[PDB]
Amino acid sequence: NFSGNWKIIRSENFEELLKVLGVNVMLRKIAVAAASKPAVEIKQEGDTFYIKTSTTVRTTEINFKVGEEFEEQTVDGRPCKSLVKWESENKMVCEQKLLKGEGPKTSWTRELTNDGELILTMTADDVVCTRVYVRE
Ligand SMILES: [Cl-]
Ligand SMILES: [Cl-]
Secondary structure, eight states, rough: OEEEEEEEEEEEEEHHHHTTTOOOOHHHHHHHHHSSSOEEEEEETEEEEEEEEEEEEEEEEEHHHTTOOEEEOOOOOEEEEEEEEEEEEEEEEEEEESSSOSSSEEHHHHHHOTTSOEEEEEEEETEEEEEEEEOO
């Protein structure tokens, strides 16, 4: 199950994800370094989740239940309305809809492997970033 404190072990394509969302080079470079050793805390109670992710300069906290819309931010920091569903046993998928304006379609997935790794994917249109974590 997803509860725990998680440390990153792999990251692919993060800078490009930000690039396609229009994030400028200075901010991209700052963000990638800032998130290179994040702190991720998850508390799962059935279908209810608390997820806190902290970088060197940012901290985000979401509280949601699978199947119930909630507000969060896109990876580039725009407010959005999100909805998580279970795709399969321990794989949740989230569609995001901007609160204001338009932009590239964004989504994320979080799944647990049999070996206890957490895989996050984040997509912005046709660009996918994958980050893998393990429990502390
Ligand atoms: Cl990366
Ligand atoms: Cl992260």
